[PDB]
Design a protein around this ligand. Structure first.
Ligand SMILES: *[C@@H]1O[C@H](CO)[C@@H](O[C@@H]2O[C@H](CO)[C@@H](O[C@@H]3O[C@H](CO[C@H]4O[C@H](CO[C@H]5O[C@H](CO)[C@@H](O)[C@H](O)[C@@H]5O[C@H]5O[C@H](CO)[C@@H](O)[C@H](O)[C@@H]5O)[C@@H](O)[C@H](O[C@H]5O[C@H](CO)[C@@H](O)[C@H](O)[C@@H]5O[C@H]5O[C@H](CO)[C@@H](O)[C@H](O)[C@@H]5O)[C@@H]4O)[C@@H](O)[C@H](O[C@@H]4O[C@H](CO)[C@@H](O)[C@H](O)[C@@H]4O)[C@@H]3O)[C@H](O)[C@H]2NC(C)=O)[C@H](O)[C@H]1NC(C)=O
Ligand SMILES: *[C@@H]1O[C@H](CO)[C@@H](O[C@@H]2O[C@H](CO)[C@@H](O[C@@H]3O[C@H](CO[C@H]4O[C@H](CO[C@H]5O[C@H](CO)[C@@H](O)[C@H](O)[C@@H]5O)[C@@H](O)[C@H](O[C@H]5O[C@H](CO)[C@@H](O)[C@H](O)[C@@H]5O)[C@@H]4O)[C@@H](O)[C@H](O[C@H]4O[C@H](CO)[C@@H](O)[C@H](O)[C@@H]4O)[C@@H]3O)[C@H](O)[C@H]2NC(C)=O)[C@H](O)[C@H]1NC(C)=O
Ligand SMILES: *[C@@H]1O[C@H](CO)[C@@H](O[C@@H]2O[C@H](CO)[C@@H](O[C@@H]3O[C@H](CO[C@H]4O[C@H](CO)[C@@H](O)[C@H](O[C@H]5O[C@H](CO)[C@@H](O)[C@H](O)[C@@H]5O)[C@@H]4O)[C@@H](O)[C@H](O)[C@@H]3O)[C@H](O)[C@H]2NC(C)=O)[C@H](O)[C@H]1NC(C)=O
Ligand SMILES: *[C@@H]1O[C@H](CO)[C@@H](O[C@@H]2O[C@H](CO)[C@@H](O[C@@H]3O[C@H](CO)[C@@H](O)[C@H](O)[C@@H]3O)[C@H](O)[C@H]2NC(C)=O)[C@H](O)[C@H]1NC(C)=O
Ligand SMILES: *[C@@H]1O[C@H](CO)[C@@H](O[C@@H]2O[C@H](CO)[C@@H](O)[C@H](O)[C@H]2NC(C)=O)[C@H](O)[C@H]1NC(C)=O
Ligand SMILES: *[C@@H]1O[C@H](CO)[C@@H](O)[C@H](O)[C@H]1NC(C)=O
Ligand SMILES: *[C@@H]1O[C@H](CO)[C@@H](O)[C@H](O)[C@H]1NC(C)=O
Ligand SMILES: OC[C@H]1O[C@@H](O)[C@H](O)[C@@H](O)[C@H]1O
Ligand code: NA
Length: 971
């Protein structure tokens, strides 16, 4: 349309005039604030055989101060774009403005609570509020487009623009979407627009007029988000109508799933992400992802591939600090989960199967393709008698854990066949699915059929290599057209049959843990068991330079096959040295297949390695691994300093400099006031972290009770004092976002002045999932209050959140990082705080009454270089009845954890190298808020590490860590 780099037809997208099956993974740059680590994520995604990454941009972090867009330092997107280009990964940009994503406000900055218009509509005030951000982010993305030499190939306007409720009846608003599209185009965006409908409803599909996107897309999370029963696969959850709906809604464009389940989020009081990983495990992937291929999906993006962390209060109340998501790449960036290895098998299959893109998806059947109704097969038939076809098979009841025997009856260029032709039966184990192929082209050689699945294939000079695999206890068969015989060139010939049937050479075999290589003419067929295949990698090999380049026919053709361990990042040829960059977490046997003709030596991670070659031309070597010593400090033994971070509870506290909560009106269009003046924090520019309110009044002696309704979001809590006297606390629960309470008060003297201090923990702002719900506008603060014997107006209020509010103090760490606690307002959470005159008390001693104390200490690290080592701060929780207390974890000024002992479920908090300094000094700080009469203290709090990984990853550069500085106007 506006450019020729990215085009499409009914079958697929074309990049540079070449068909490309887009297999993408979702990654959020703001959830990993360490620029030097972006390359690690991209290389791990590229190693799966993927060629694209989808990302959101969080507006709340870029325009915290209305009118000032800021995306520099850790918020700079350039290093993210650079890493993508370096790794050879294209990008789908999804800037919102609304992104949902389980982040605070669903992306909306807190000041949107003051906008007089319904969010995500054509209301004038809302549209105008988005103009500054939209112009800036679109301009940034425009420069990184493929048309300008960058990685960005697609652009998503809005997010799940799929429904409305609660009084808003303008959906679907054609001019609303057209407005977002026009503005992006006006800012320079020329790549195609792709949508992500919540369900297959055809919203904004081509031909729908104003607002229509270029390529219609939709999302799907068939197993839901409740990970409590990981082995339970509900009846009917597997979708079977995606192809039918696609042909009715957008037949002119490639079938696209812009967001397909790759894990699940987890709420406060949830079950933990380990269970989400177990629900969306490797079995889920092979069954559901192959099911997507049965529909002929041409663009598939998995949400999330890497989740990261909701550091610095960036998340919503519907979730906690961690955003591990149970995805293939863990929060600490590791790839030990079996689902990662399984996904690699499918990604690599797609990367070498262009015939799949031009096959025609058909109707599923329980009788046409096998001899048993217990199995369902969906065909993707070739255009003509000689074109390749694909058959996706699964149990008819997708949740079945049964093992079923069968015979395949499919059409081929040689007629309708009944496989296995040489005898025996095929097997489909519990919760497994396979893609059987017919007339599969391997560089000119026709594989009439193969029951075992294809991992990859390559042509090296005149030699052709095909890698097949089967699951445990399976019997398979394949046939090569025009071949005359075969020879077993590796392994025993036991269990392998070879015979000519018609004009094809048929080979039968049984899966084994021992690899077998069968030579059929110029074709070498590797016969593997699934678990051995897990250790194979297919790195591209650059002609010149070290970067692999984007994925296309040429770069795919010159790739090599490497059997190794934990990870293979890349490979390149320099002179006669073949360089391979890899990671190891154990002693690892190495095998290189297809080394370039000019390659004479093998260099692994810069080290010359002793290599030997076998009969099949395979290079072999070994990499030894020895767990290094990792010296970590004992947190309990460090020297701690602490200070009372609730000076407001003293009669000497002066709040004159605090903001006066004197607005006799609210700017919140979704909530009318119930108090004399607004006590909604956002009306005064305070949208993040602890919020404090102080109500001044002169007693008349008739007071008895103080009723109050506070609101801080799901799992929040509050504590109250009247002058120096403790009144009470609401410790919170996983199902409460607000609380009503009538507190009795101690006797007061008529004529004297008192101040009621209310401390409220803000858990973030809500998303606005359904247009018209205005949920994002749910306020934070005091909703109602009543002091018996007194008029409400008798109380004059002061309030404070983070120092400066929207005019936040930490431009480096962002608008959400710090809250309103005294120590935070002073900047004591940063490196080198002024602890000279502080008390020498540690969090292991804690408090003996309700209150809040701030702790500080430091420790040095000097971890072994050459290793990628994940570090975690772990809190103990072994008691039956949990004490009620809240903790905020600060590392070198960055808040990396909110711990609520009585709500959970997170006890282990990972912090990446870059935030933590592995070869320098580190400043640790904690706020400890006791919400029970007996006070609170930590019994177990440690810094621990997981398996050290011998890596080729470059040394991580520490991010900017601004030190403490006395702040003007602080209080
Ligand atoms: C360094 O990094 C690496 C990554 O690069 C890390 O390695 C990963 O570690 C994961 C553990 O955290 C592991 O995942 C768990 O796997 C458990 C084992 O089950 C799987 O493997 C069985 C085969 O075992 C062989 O392979 C595995 C590795 O895949 C290895 O650990 C074993 O020692 C063994 O290796 C030997 O053989 C291979 C070749 O085969 C060689 O390469 C090796 O050198 C060794 O010689 C496999 O049978 C099993 O599959 C069956 O079961 C699953 C369900 O669990 C079915 O889906 C599947 O269909 C199949 O079932 C059929 O067949 C069986 C057998 O006939 C039959 O009985 C059934 O009826 C059915 O017909 C798996 O692939 C697994 O138990 C575990 O699951 C957990 O527990 C429960 C299950 O009880 C589960 O529900 C929970 O969700 C939970 O996850 C995990 O899945 C990864 O596989 C592994 N990846 C790699 C690449 O190795 C390594 O940890 C790290 N090291 C350090 C120090 O950090
Ligand atoms: C450290 O380990 C400890 C364990 O040792 C662990 O503590 C457990 O944490 C879990 C998860 O947070 C707790 O389980 C949840 O508890 C929720 C809170 O339950 C209480 O509060 C409810 C709300 O009360 C207020 O609001 C309601 C209306 O909103 C109002 O009526 C009330 O008056 C009040 O204002 C309340 O409804 C609930 O009442 C039930 O239970 C009591 C006690 O038996 C009973 O008398 C009542 O009749 C009623 O049955 C209770 O008072 C709870 O809401 C939540 O349940 C929801 O979610 C689950 C899904 O997880 C759903 O299955 C369920 O249907 C609900 O939707 C859930 O049960 C658990 O209580 C803790 N265990 C202990 C011993 O304290 C820590 O989290 C760990 N910490 C870390 C860091 O990991
Ligand atoms: C703490 O106590 C408060 C009440 O003091 C609880 O909130 C009430 O909860 C009940 C039960 O869910 C709700 O009852 C529903 O009311 C519907 C009608 O709502 C309108 O009329 C209400 C009465 O005047 C009014 O309060 C309410 O205002 C809300 O919506 C407005 C527009 O959306 C908004 O401008 C206001 O700011 C406010 O948010 C509506 O105008 C009725 O149709 C339902 O059948 C049902 O009866 C009350 O509406 C709730 N009241 C409020 C103010 O929200 C709260 O749940 C308690 N907290 C806990 C944890 O228990
Ligand atoms: C890779 O990263 C993941 C995510 O951070 C790490 O997973 C966490 O691993 C720990 C330890 O195995 C899990 O805790 C354990 O849970 C079991 C089950 O309750 C319990 O029996 C053990 O005593 C222990 O508590 C934790 O649940 C898990 N968390 C998540 C989100 O999955 C993993 O450790 C990392 N692996 C490596 C090698 O770095
Ligand atoms: C409750 O606290 C308030 C302060 O918030 C007290 O009032 C201040 O008292 C100090 C002396 O301690 C004076 O210097 C200030 O001028 C007072 N300011 C106000 C608002 O009057 C108040 O006296 C305390 N009440 C009681 C009974 O102790
Ligand atoms: C081959 O099998 C198909 C079923 O897929 C059937 O429709 C056809 O009649 C059979 N014979 C032909 C035409 O090859
Ligand atoms: C908030 O309300 C006040 C009073 O009506 C008004 O002056 C101000 O412009 C409003 N702010 C916004 C952003 O609408
Ligand atoms: O994690 C669930 C995801 O579901 C998608 O539909 C949504 O667009 C994402 O923003 C996220 O909420
Ligand atoms: Na827990």
């Amino acid at each position: 349309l506006l450019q020729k780099y990215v085009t499409w037809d009914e079958h697929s997208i074309f990049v540079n005039g070449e068909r490309l099956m887009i297999f993408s993974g979702e990654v959020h740059p703001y959830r990993l604030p360490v620029a030097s680590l972006y390359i690690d994520i991209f290389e791990k995604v590229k190693a799966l055989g993927f060629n694209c990454v989808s990302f959101y941009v969080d507006w709340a972090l870029l325009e915290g101060n209305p009118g000032h867009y800021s995306a520099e330092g850790i918020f700079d997107l350039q290093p993210f774009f650079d890493a993508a280009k370096e790794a050879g990964i294209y990008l789908l940009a999804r800037p919102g403005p609304y992104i949902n994503a389980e982040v605070s406000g669903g992306g909306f900055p807190g000041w949107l609570q003051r906008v007089d218009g319904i969010l995500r509509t054509s209301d004038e005030a809302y549209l105008k509020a988005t103009d500054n951000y939209a112009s800036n982010i679109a301009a940034t993305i425009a420069k990184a487009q493929i048309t300008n030499g960058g990685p960005i190939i697609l652009y998503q306007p809005e997010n799940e623009y799929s429904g409305a409720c609660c009084g808003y009846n303008g959906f679907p608003d054609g001019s609303y979407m057209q407005y977002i599209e026009d503005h992006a185009r006006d800012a320079g965006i020329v790549v195609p627009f792709i949508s992500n409908d919540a369900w297959a409803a055809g919203h904004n599909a081509p031909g729908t007029g104003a607002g229509a996107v270029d390529i219609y897309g939709h999302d799907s999370y068939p197993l839901g988000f409740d990970c409590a029963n990981p082995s339970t696969w509900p009846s009917g959850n597997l979708p079977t109508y995606f192809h039918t709906s696609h042909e009715q809604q957008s037949p002119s464009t490639p079938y696209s799933l812009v967001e397909f389940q790759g894990g699940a989020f987890d709420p406060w009081g949830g079950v933990g992400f380990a269970k989400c990983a177990a629900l969306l495990n490797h079995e889920f992937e092979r069954v559901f992802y192959k099911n997507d291929f049965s529909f002929g999906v041409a663009f598939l993006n998995l949400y999330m591939i890497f989740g990261g962390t909701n550091w610095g209060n960036l998340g919503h109340p519907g979730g906690y600090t961690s955003y591990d998501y149970g995805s293939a790449i863990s929060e600490s960036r590791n790839i030990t989960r079996e689902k990662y290895s399984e996904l690699k098998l499918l990604g690599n299959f797609a990367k070498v199967s262009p015939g799949y893109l031009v096959a025609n998806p058909g109707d599923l059947s329980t009788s046409t393709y096998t001899n048993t109704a217990d199995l369902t097969v969906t065909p993707l038939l070739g255009s003509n008698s000689s074109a390749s076809s694909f058959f996706v098979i699964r149990h008819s009841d997708y949740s079945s854990q049964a093992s079923v025997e069968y015979k395949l009856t499919v059409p081929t260029s040689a007629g309708n066949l009944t496989i296995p032709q040489l005898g025996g039966s095929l097997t489909l184990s519990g919760r497994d699915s396979k893609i059987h192929v017919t007339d599969y082209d391997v560089a000119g050689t026709n594989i009439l059929y193969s029951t075992a699945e294809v991992f990859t294939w390559k042509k090296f000079n005149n030699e052709k290599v095909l890698v097949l695999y089967g699951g445990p206890g399976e019997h398979h068969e394949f046939a090569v057209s025009g071949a005359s015989s075969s020879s077993v060139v590796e392994g025993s010939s036991s269990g392998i049959s070879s015979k000519k049937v018609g004009k094809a050479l048929v080979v039968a075999w049984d899966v084994s843990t021992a690899r077998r290589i069968v030579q059929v003419g110029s074709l070498k067929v590797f016969l593997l068991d699934r678990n051995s295949a897990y250790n194979y990698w297919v790195p591209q090999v650059p002609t010149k330079g070290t970067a692999p380049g984007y994925s296309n026919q040429e770069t795919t053709a010159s790739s090599i096959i490497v059997k190794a361990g934990y990870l293979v990042r890349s490979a390149y040829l320099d002179g006669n040295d073949l360089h391979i960059q890899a990671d190891f977490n154990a002693t690892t046997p190495i095998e290189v297949v297809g080394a370039p003709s000019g390659a004479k030596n093998l260099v692994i991670n810069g080290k010359k390695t002793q290599t030997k070659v076998d009969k099949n031309g395979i290079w072999s070597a070994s990499v030894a691994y020895t767990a290094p010593k990792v010296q970590l400090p004992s947190l309990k033994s460090l020297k701690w300093k602490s200070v009372d971070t609730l000076p407001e509870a003293k009669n000497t506290y002066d709040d004159s400099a605090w903001t006066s909560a004197d607005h006799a009106y609210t700017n919140n269009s979704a909530h009318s006031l119930q108090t004399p003046t607004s006590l909604f924090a956002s009306d005064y520019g305070y949208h993040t972290g602890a919020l404090l309110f102080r109500g001044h009044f002169t007693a008349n002696g008739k007071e008895k009770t103080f009723f109050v309704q506070t609101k801080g979001g799901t799992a929040y809590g509050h504590s109250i004092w009247i002058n120096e006297t403790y009144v009470g606390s609401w410790a919170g629960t996983s199902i409460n976002d607000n609380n009503n309470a009538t507190y009795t008060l101690p006797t007061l003297q008529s004529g004297k002045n008192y101040v009621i201090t209310v401390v409220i923990d803000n858990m973030g702002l809500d998303e606005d999932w359904t247009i018209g719900s205005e949920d994002m506008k749910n306020p934070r603060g005091i909703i109602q209050y009543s002091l018996s014997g007194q008029e409400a107006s008798a109380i004059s209020w002061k309030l404070t959140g983070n120092l400066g509010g929207e005019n936040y103090r930490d431009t480096v760490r962002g608008p959400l990082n710090e809250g309103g606690l005294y120590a935070e307002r002073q900047g004591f959470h940063q490196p080198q705080p002024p602890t000279q005159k502080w008390d020498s008390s540690s969090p292991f001693t804690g408090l003996t009454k309700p209150g809040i104390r701030f702790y500080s200490t430091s420790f040095d690290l000097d971890l072994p270089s050459g290793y990628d080592i994940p570090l975690y701060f772990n809190f103990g929780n072994s008691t039956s009845t949990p004490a009620a207390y809240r903790v905020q974890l600060y590392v070198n000024g960055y808040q990396y954890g909110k711990y609520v002992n009585n709500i959970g479920p997170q006890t282990s908090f990972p912090v990446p190298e870059g935030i933590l300094n592995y070869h320098g000094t580190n400043w640790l700080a904690l706020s400890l808020w006791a919400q029970e009469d007996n006070g609170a203290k930590l019994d177990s709090f440690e810094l621990i590490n997981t398996t050290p990984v011998l890596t080729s990853l470059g040394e991580v550069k520490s991010v900017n860590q601004p030190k403490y500085q006395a702040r003007k106007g602080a209080y």
